[PDB]
Amino acid sequence: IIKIRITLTSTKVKQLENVSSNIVKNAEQHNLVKKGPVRLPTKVLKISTRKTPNGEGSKTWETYEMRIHKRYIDLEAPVQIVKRITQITIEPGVDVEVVVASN
Amino acid sequence: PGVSVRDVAAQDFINAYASFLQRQGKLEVPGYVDIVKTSSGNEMPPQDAEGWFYKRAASVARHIYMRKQVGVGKLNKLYGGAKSRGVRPYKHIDASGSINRKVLQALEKIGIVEISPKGGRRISENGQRDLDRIAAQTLEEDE
Amino acid sequence: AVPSVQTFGKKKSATAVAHVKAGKGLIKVNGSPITLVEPEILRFKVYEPLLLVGLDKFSNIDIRVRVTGGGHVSQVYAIRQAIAKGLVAYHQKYVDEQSKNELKKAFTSYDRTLLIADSRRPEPKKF
Amino acid sequence: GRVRTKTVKRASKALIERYYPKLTLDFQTNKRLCDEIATIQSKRLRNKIAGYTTHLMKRIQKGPVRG
Amino acid sequence: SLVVQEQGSFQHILRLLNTNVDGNIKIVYALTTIKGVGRRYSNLVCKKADVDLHKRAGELTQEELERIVQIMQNPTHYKIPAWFLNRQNDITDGKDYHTLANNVESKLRDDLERLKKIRAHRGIRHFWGLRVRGQ
Amino acid sequence: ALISKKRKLVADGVFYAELNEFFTRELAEEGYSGVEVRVTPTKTEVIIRATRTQDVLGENGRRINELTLLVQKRFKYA
Amino acid sequence: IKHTLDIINVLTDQNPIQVVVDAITNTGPREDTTRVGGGGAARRQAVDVSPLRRVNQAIALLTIGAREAAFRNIKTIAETLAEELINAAKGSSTSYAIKKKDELERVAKSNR
Amino acid sequence: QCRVCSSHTGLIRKYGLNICRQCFREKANDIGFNKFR
RNA sequence: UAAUUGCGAUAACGAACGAGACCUUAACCUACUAAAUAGUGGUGCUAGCAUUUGCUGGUUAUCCACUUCUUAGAGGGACUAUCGGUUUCAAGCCGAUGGAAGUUUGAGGCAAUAACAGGUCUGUGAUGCCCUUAGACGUUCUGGGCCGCACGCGCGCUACACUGACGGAGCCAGCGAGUCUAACCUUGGCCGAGAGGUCUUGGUAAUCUUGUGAAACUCCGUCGUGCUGGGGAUAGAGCAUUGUA
Ligand SMILES: [Zn+2]
């Protein structure tokens, strides 16, 4: 009997939501008790970059961006279900994390 | 329909409680008060040299009643003085912690504040009773 | 289950949530009365939803308000808008429809921001 | 100038040229009609074309056009 | 507060510690006039001599002037700690002093002539300074 | 071990970037298509999607060893 | 402004609002001048300023005159603002705004 | 120095990446930094 | 016409890439579909004050419901809509109205094209230069520099106050960032005028710092137009911190 918390972090929402809905429906279709995929605020990391490369012309400015989305799902299952689901769900772009403790 | 601190104006309540501490006379007052400025971001010491320690004990009591628990650092942030650095612009300077800490020890010794397990100075039950009573009085003077 | 109605109010990223339930008739912003606002000048603004429709409309409702974000002015506008909104919503769900609409008429006649939030969102600096 | 790019004007021209019947003065039905008769890759450009077929439909009910 | 009226009594220009003090300014900013004593020092000294500063400098007796001049020369015996003093922890004597109006300049010359007799960078730069800038 | 989350993920992006660069530069005559790095509990698996593996896996497997050590020696893996 | 209104009341004036409005009415220049070309040495054509800019220029001359008076004197701004608004409520040529209005209309008159 | 082009100059020493701005602008797309706005 | 953008006239008629546009973003959604790493209300456990219902809290799980506020989306949504001026009454322009949003609601990346002695590759080839090496272009080790001050030039910061300074109290944000094989962001308790010290602690973080209790600002006082209590240059003595210094 293991009560585990899972947290995903990704920049591409399609792969992240693919993995999220996969884990959701795969966790309920074999009867588990869970808290649905809770959605943390998409943090938008921006980088201010000067328009001027060569010292010609006045100084005006620009901006680069990244959107980082994070989800979390809570579950209760044995050791084998967690191992197998963690091995099966591995995807590129999406970063999965499995924590066992509840403190 | 009860008399409390959450009903009165601040400048009235602190006038009150200051007069209470000034006439009752039962507090713990240190000898540096007649010398000390309340913040490093200060140019001159307080104008009420003989009854401002009770003004700060009052402001503190009323500010600890209003929430869970606060430390001496939150009092440095509350006292919080804006300091000029000459040709340099104004900064936020934390105030003296001796005034705050000794205010807390002198209001704990007399039974108005109490150190709470969340490591923070919490308003005591007798502090609640007495502050709400003097709030009743401040509401009686207007009647 | 006391008949309650929750309505918010926004001004320049300052929000005020207003909980209008059925009580003896008490009006409080942040656990402090509406009589003692931080700005002493902007005071009357927070009064304007109480005066524009009569001072009796409140004898049946206890109104709560909590304000986060912004400064002092932003939150004054937030709480007066939250007050007006909470009033006309309690009057929509509980009192009849004509009372609620005479209330929104009374509100819109003087300040059309009492029912609609501020439409001057902070400009993107345009790089 | 909100001058509609040549794709919008040309598509409006053609859509009214063969499907004059089912289009009216209303954009809301010309839109879903532009969904059921045409295959436009974007919703925005489809709102563009269907809206310009709406304006043009308001211009053809008064007189004969160059089409 | 209280409109209390006194016929005469106050003088216009007084003098203490061989320095001129003008009597219609508050006592703090009347004592600030001299060298060696500023706003904050006159404030603390007039909190120590137990003189009411909200009462102007035209309302002060000579009995208060004797206490003030007393605290001038014994600031460590009236409980004004060593942090408050201009010349504290002197190298010449190992004590703490608060220097007055005509003595601050003599202490300055003592200091710069200390650095000149030793021949430090400060001395040479100071003297070559004054010399060449003045010439 | 232990780098801040954003810095961890960005440094993993830099890692994939640099190994993709090195593998495009090295296996140019082995029809190199791409790479995929899988982080596992014990070891790290750098899979080389290269459309001519008979050369990447040379005599006795040598050209793979020679590569791993490289991707080891500069990146300082145990 | 609330202080100023507290002063105009204790200045024996029953309606401070009508005092201010009459100041605004009295201090807005009817006709003005413009620096039109004319060929190098630019003469000044007498124009007739708009009611909008009349009110604008009025409030302007008022606030500016009052601030220009309340600078470096002990009087508070509300008292020279009430002072200005009352010397201009019923123009007395002791106010700044009536001065400047009369001079603008005078040079507008001389230049036609 | 910039761990790409032998350059003491331009260094973005932030986050421990240490690429000069010129090379970091190029490697930006391979690192993860893309043009949004 | 914003435009060689089109209508029209026409020994010219096609067709390509320019312009637009493709691309990435904003503000409304009490309607979806969804929450102890966000919050609200109700309920219990519980404190104080009034007591006549009431008021202000404590309880990171005592439970329940919500997303109205926060937040991942999906949709929608705008099409210059509608009306009127203006224009060959042709593509369009302009005013009003409605609209979350109607200057192209507003920002910028993507080409092909024809111009570049522009930067380096630590790419290569018996390739033309000076020599070839006691040269220091290599290393090091100390200590000085980069600020040194008649001045010219410029970006600024603080100011000449009384819509102000000082002294009392009120007390409201958002963008961030933060420690491993290390010492980062740091609550709180004691010592200290302060600066700081000391004993602990939470947080690798929507969980802790942190509600970043920010300042201008609000209010109650001191001063009163005096280079003043405006201004805080320059200079003296002390006390501590960062750092091998
Ligand atoms: Zn580089």
Side-chain angles (χ1 to χ4, degrees):
Chain A
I1 326 174
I2 301 185
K3 286 199 177 180
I4 260 173
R5 180 184 205 181
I6 316 169
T7 297
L8 310 169
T9 171
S10 188
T11 57
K12 36 219 58 185
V13 252
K14 294 305 167 189
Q15 281 54 260
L16 184 58
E17 229 51 71
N18 194 340
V19 167
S20 186
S21 61
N22 174 40
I23 292 314
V24 160
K25 297 177 189 178
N26 175 252
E28 189 175 346
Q29 78 182 17
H30 77 275
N31 299 321
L32 289 187
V33 45
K34 77 186 178 198
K35 306 232 156 192
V38 197
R39 288 115 191 183
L40 301 177
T42 289
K43 58 180 179 191
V44 182
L45 182 65
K46 2 178 188 175
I47 288 190
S48 300
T49 294
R50 215 178 207 178
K51 289 194 191 171
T52 322
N54 323 311
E56 300 161 18
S58 65
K59 313 304 175 182
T60 36
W61 297 80
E62 280 174 343
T63 313
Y64 288 81
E65 282 192 0
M66 278 191 67
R67 276 82 183 267
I68 315 142
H69 329 268
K70 294 204 174 190
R71 259 54 122 183
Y72 66 88
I73 310 181
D74 294 272
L75 280 164
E76 180 200 343
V79 198
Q80 299 172 7
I81 302 186
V82 172
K83 285 187 181 180
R84 288 187 178 182
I85 285 180
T86 304
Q87 288 184 9
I88 291 178
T89 324
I90 303 174
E91 294 293 335
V94 185
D95 310 318
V96 191
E97 282 199 13
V98 177
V99 190
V100 185
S102 56
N103 222 330
Chain B
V3 274
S4 61
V5 188
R6 305 271 186 166
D7 299 327
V8 302
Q11 306 181 338
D12 299 325
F13 180 92
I14 299 197
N15 283 330
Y17 213 71
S19 63
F20 280 94
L21 304 182
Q22 277 158 355
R23 300 169 190 181
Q24 291 173 8
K26 277 185 174 178
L27 266 197
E28 205 78 21
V29 181
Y32 61 74
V33 170
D34 284 342
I35 303 187
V36 168
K37 31 129 194 179
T38 187
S39 69
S40 35
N42 249 352
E43 193 172 340
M44 296 291 290
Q47 285 176 347
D48 278 341
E50 296 185 354
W52 71 272
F53 196 76
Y54 317 101
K55 283 294 181 187
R56 268 317 183 180
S59 188
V60 156
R62 150 162 165 78
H63 225 268
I64 296 185
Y65 174 93
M66 256 169 48
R67 55 201 75 213
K68 301 179 180 55
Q69 60 277 315
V70 286
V72 183
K74 308 286 177 170
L75 299 176
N76 293 327
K77 197 164 195 171
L78 172 62
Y79 291 36
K83 185 202 173 184
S84 185
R85 309 202 318 282
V87 66
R88 312 183 152 202
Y90 285 79
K91 256 186 186 176
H92 184 211
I93 304 297
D94 313 343
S96 64
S98 193
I99 297 297
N100 322 342
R101 204 196 314 105
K102 273 62 184 72
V103 152
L104 292 182
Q105 299 153 354
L107 280 181
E108 180 192 3
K109 186 178 310 183
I110 214 70
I112 308 175
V113 87
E114 53 187 18
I115 300 187
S116 66
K118 282 191 176 177
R121 247 78 163 212
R122 172 225 299 150
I123 185 72
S124 68
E125 61 286 339
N126 180 269
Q128 295 172 78
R129 184 264 191 277
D130 266 78
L131 255 85
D132 294 18
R133 185 257 281 167
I134 78 102
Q137 300 198 209
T138 308
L139 271 158
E140 294 297 339
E141 307 296 334
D142 322 321
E143 119 277 39
Chain C
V2 171
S4 58
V5 159
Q6 305 188 19
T7 334
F8 74 128
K10 287 185 177 177
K11 166 79 172 180
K12 207 174 168 185
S13 86
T15 315
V17 182
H19 311 100
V20 184
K21 55 183 171 187
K24 198 177 186 183
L26 182 130
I27 338 172
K28 289 241 179 180
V29 177
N30 285 331
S32 300
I34 200 188
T35 306
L36 315 165
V37 194
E38 294 185 26
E40 189 220 355
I41 291 181
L42 310 182
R43 184 77 63 89
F44 290 90
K45 245 52 184 62
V46 203
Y47 284 104
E48 289 177 0
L50 324 181
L51 331 157
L52 191 52
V53 208
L55 317 171
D56 64 333
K57 220 77 52 183
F58 304 85
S59 285
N60 81 309
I61 56 177
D62 201 306
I63 307 186
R64 302 315 193 170
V65 165
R66 297 194 169 193
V67 231
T68 46
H72 290 179
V73 190
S74 205
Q75 287 177 347
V76 153
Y77 282 68
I79 66 187
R80 64 188 282 272
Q81 180 177 307
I83 283 173
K85 274 192 183 179
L87 186 63
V88 292
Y90 188 104
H91 264 249
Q92 181 172 1
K93 209 184 71 189
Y94 292 127
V95 204
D96 66 307
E97 211 73 14
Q98 194 178 12
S99 62
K100 158 223 146 179
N101 270 94
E102 292 152 350
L103 269 46
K104 283 179 180 174
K105 202 173 181 180
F107 280 146
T108 309
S109 296
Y110 168 76
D111 195 345
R112 297 191 175 182
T113 321
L114 277 167
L115 307 178
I116 316 179
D118 203 317
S119 67
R120 284 191 294 158
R121 314 298 184 175
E123 181 176 7
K125 281 205 164 180
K126 197 154 133 175
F127 58 86
Chain D
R2 198 105 81 108
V3 185
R4 298 70 158 167
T5 190
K6 32 189 169 184
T7 72
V8 171
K9 283 196 268 286
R10 201 186 325 267
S12 296
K13 193 182 189 307
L15 277 174
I16 301 188
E17 266 174 357
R18 42 219 68 193
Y19 289 82
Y20 188 90
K22 305 188 175 189
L23 299 169
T24 343
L25 302 193
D26 178 70
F27 165 74
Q28 233 67 214
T29 179
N30 295 9
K31 171 193 51 186
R32 296 279 148 84
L33 221 186
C34 275
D35 290 23
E36 299 286 316
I37 198 267
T39 308
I40 311 175
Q41 314 306 312
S42 49
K43 170 179 56 187
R44 160 176 169 81
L45 197 270
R46 171 257 290 164
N47 283 334
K48 248 89 152 59
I49 297 179
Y52 196 60
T53 69
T54 292
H55 167 48
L56 284 188
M57 266 289 151
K58 224 180 200 65
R59 293 201 74 259
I60 316 207
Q61 290 188 359
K62 292 195 167 186
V65 201
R66 212 76 163 175
Chain E
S1 48
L2 295 175
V3 169
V4 180
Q5 289 275 7
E6 298 177 30
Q7 191 169 22
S9 179
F10 76 94
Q11 295 200 12
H12 300 300
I13 302 179
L14 293 172
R15 171 198 170 199
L16 193 69
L17 206 54
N18 303 332
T19 329
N20 308 345
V21 182
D22 300 338
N24 44 22
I25 325 173
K26 298 296 177 182
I27 319 182
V28 225
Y29 312 91
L31 286 162
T32 306
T33 311
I34 77 177
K35 320 289 185 181
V37 177
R39 294 186 212 152
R40 168 68 166 161
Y41 192 74
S42 171
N43 194 262
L44 183 56
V45 165
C46 274
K47 282 184 181 183
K48 291 298 175 181
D50 291 330
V51 168
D52 297 328
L53 285 175
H54 297 264
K55 305 175 183 175
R56 288 184 174 176
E59 301 176 357
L60 213 58
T61 331
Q62 304 166 352
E63 69 207 6
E64 314 270 29
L65 305 192
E66 281 145 353
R67 298 185 187 184
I68 282 174
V69 175
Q70 256 294 288
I71 305 183
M72 286 299 103
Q73 44 217 172
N74 295 323
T76 186
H77 302 297
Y78 297 83
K79 289 181 177 183
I80 307 168
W83 69 63
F84 220 92
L85 320 174
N86 300 8
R87 280 193 55 109
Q88 187 219 346
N89 276 339
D90 282 38
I91 284 196
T92 303
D93 300 310
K95 323 176 203 163
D96 55 337
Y97 308 78
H98 188 99
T99 338
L100 296 175
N102 268 333
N103 301 309
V104 275
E105 301 185 9
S106 72
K107 298 309 176 176
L108 188 84
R109 310 313 180 143
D110 292 329
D111 296 4
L112 288 167
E113 279 294 289
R114 180 181 180 174
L115 286 173
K116 164 60 198 180
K117 208 162 309 180
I118 300 168
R119 301 219 175 189
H121 189 74
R122 274 185 162 178
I124 312 159
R125 185 183 164 189
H126 177 74
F127 282 84
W128 178 91
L130 304 184
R131 284 177 190 183
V132 173
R133 321 315 182 194
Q135 290 151 2
Chain F
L2 211 298
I3 307 293
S4 189
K5 229 57 255 162
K6 312 188 196 184
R7 256 162 51 219
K8 158 83 67 60
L9 306 179
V10 168
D12 284 1
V14 179
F15 176 75
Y16 169 79
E18 192 167 3
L19 266 197
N20 202 43
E21 259 250 17
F22 164 62
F23 280 138
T24 296
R25 292 185 169 272
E26 189 89 320
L27 308 165
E29 296 182 355
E30 279 77 50
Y32 168 82
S33 178
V35 284
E36 40 159 331
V37 44
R38 308 171 192 171
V39 42
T40 58
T42 313
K43 302 170 185 187
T44 323
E45 304 166 338
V46 185
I47 286 82
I48 325 294
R49 293 154 63 255
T51 62
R52 201 186 296 177
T53 287
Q54 177 61 19
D55 300 352
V56 189
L57 271 165
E59 303 186 359
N60 294 337
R62 171 186 180 175
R63 293 201 199 176
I64 279 301
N65 187 38
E66 152 184 350
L67 267 180
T68 66
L69 289 160
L70 288 173
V71 180
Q72 180 182 297
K73 289 315 165 188
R74 185 250 178 277
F75 289 100
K76 299 175 188 176
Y77 280 96
Chain G
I1 279 301
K2 181 251 179 184
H3 281 357
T4 300
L5 297 165
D6 279 329
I7 307 158
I8 300 186
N9 266 341
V10 204
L11 262 156
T12 331
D13 296 321
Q14 302 174 349
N15 35 39
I17 322 186
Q18 295 185 13
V19 159
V20 178
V21 178
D22 293 332
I24 309 284
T25 294
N26 295 328
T27 56
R30 304 184 208 98
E31 76 167 353
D32 213 337
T33 35
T34 186
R35 264 271 304 275
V36 65
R43 35 84 98 250
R44 298 83 188 178
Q45 174 145 11
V47 291
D48 291 83
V49 1
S50 57
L52 199 44
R53 186 166 183 267
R54 266 219 303 163
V55 185
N56 296 359
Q57 224 167 9
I59 298 188
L61 291 169
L62 292 176
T63 58
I64 282 181
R67 185 179 311 100
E68 206 167 287
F71 186 51
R72 300 218 211 172
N73 77 329
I74 296 90
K75 256 205 189 63
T76 61
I77 272 277
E79 298 185 13
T80 65
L81 201 262
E83 179 173 1
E84 181 77 14
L85 275 170
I86 279 177
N87 280 326
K90 301 190 174 181
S92 181
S93 289
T94 60
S95 49
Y96 172 88
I98 287 289
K99 277 176 185 59
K100 289 308 178 67
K101 169 228 182 185
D102 293 346
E103 269 16 78
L104 294 180
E105 300 173 356
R106 157 236 174 174
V107 186
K109 254 207 149 181
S110 171
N111 298 153
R112 127 249 289 182
Chain H
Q1 38 171 17
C2 156
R3 64 164 72 213
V4 185
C5 76
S6 323
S7 187
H8 293 268
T9 299
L11 256 180
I12 310 279
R13 223 152 62 110
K14 193 179 181 181
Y15 292 151
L17 60 95
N18 271 262
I19 319 281
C20 79
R21 47 184 197 94
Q22 285 104 347
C23 297
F24 172 72
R25 274 179 45 89
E26 304 171 11
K27 315 298 179 179
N29 200 280
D30 271 326
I31 289 177
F33 292 104
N34 300 86
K35 287 265 296 180
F36 275 136
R37 189 178 56 107

